[PDB]
Coordinates of C-alpha atoms in Angstrom, one line a residue:
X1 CA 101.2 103.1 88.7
X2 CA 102.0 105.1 92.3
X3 CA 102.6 100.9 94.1
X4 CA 105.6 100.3 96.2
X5 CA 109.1 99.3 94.7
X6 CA 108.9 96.2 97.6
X7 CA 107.5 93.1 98.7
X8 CA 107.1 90.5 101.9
X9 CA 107.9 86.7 101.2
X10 CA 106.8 84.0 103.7
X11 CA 107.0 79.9 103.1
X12 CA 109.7 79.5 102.2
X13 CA 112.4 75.8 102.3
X14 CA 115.1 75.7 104.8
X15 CA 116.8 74.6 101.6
X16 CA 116.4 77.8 100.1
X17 CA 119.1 80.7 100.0
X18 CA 118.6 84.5 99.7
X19 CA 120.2 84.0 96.3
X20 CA 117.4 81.6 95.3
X21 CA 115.0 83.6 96.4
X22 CA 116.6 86.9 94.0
X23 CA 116.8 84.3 91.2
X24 CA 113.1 83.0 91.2
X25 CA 111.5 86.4 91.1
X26 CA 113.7 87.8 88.0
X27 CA 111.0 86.3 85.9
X28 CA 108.3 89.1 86.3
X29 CA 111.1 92.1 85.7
X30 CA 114.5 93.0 87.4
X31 CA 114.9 92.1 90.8
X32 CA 117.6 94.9 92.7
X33 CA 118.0 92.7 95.7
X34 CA 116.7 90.0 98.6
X35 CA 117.0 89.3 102.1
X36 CA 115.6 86.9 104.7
X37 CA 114.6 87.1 108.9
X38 CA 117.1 85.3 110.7
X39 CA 117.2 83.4 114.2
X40 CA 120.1 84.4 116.4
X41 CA 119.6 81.2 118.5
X42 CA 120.3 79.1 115.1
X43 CA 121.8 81.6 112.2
X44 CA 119.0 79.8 109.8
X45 CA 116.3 81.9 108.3
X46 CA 112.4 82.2 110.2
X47 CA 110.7 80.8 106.5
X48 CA 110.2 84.7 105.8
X49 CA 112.0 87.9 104.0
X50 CA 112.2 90.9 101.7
X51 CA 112.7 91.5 97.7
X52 CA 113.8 94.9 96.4
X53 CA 112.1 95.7 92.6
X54 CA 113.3 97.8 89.7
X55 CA 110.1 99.3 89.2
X56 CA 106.5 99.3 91.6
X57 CA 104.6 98.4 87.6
X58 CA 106.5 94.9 88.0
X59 CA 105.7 94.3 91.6
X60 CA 101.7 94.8 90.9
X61 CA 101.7 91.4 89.2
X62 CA 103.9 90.1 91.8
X63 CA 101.7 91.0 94.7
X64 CA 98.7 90.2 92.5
X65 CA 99.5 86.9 92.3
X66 CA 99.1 84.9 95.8
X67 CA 101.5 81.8 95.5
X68 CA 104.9 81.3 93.6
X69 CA 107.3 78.6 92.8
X70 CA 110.7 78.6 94.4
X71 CA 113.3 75.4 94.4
X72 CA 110.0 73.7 93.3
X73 CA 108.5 74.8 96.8
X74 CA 105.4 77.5 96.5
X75 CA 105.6 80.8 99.0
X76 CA 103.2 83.0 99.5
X77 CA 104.2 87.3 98.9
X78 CA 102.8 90.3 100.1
X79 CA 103.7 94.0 100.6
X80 CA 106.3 96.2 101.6
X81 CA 107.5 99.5 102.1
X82 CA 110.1 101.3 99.6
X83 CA 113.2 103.0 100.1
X84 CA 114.8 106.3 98.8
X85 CA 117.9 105.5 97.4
X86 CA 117.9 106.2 93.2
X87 CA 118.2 109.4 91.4
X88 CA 116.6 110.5 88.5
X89 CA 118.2 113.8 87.7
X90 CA 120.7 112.8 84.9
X91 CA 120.9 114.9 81.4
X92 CA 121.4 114.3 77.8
X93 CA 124.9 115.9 77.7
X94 CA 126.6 116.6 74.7
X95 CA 128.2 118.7 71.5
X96 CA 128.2 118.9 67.9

């Protein structure tokens, strides 16, 4: 109710992938997207990044909670600013 539609992530394996990372958090509600800071000196991610939500009454329990498992490995979340990009104007169009 009136909470962001994103989140931080930070902790995370140099194992891990972006794709891991959109997997894992799926299990609260739909997960849009992910992304992840990385070094220009190594192209590896920092340990740190981004996930887009569905809806900001998913990502209350996700911020809620401090830790959360990913490839086994537990990373700490935090929040984030939304982003315009949806539209709800649609219609019920039809005839007899």
């Amino acid at each position: 109710g009136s909470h962001m539609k994103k989140i931080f992530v930070g902790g995370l394996s140099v194992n891990t992938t972006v794709e891991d990372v959109k997997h894992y958090f799926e299990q609260f509600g739909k997960v849009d997207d992910a992304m992840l800071m990385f070094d220009k000196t190594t192209n590896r991610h920092r340990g740190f990044g981004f996930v887009t939500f569905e809806s900001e009454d998913i990502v209350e329990k996700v911020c809620e909670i401090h830790f959360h498992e990913i490839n086994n490995k537990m990373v700490e979340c935090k929040k984030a600013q939304p982003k315009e990009v949806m539209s709800p104007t649609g219609s019920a169009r039809g005839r007899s």
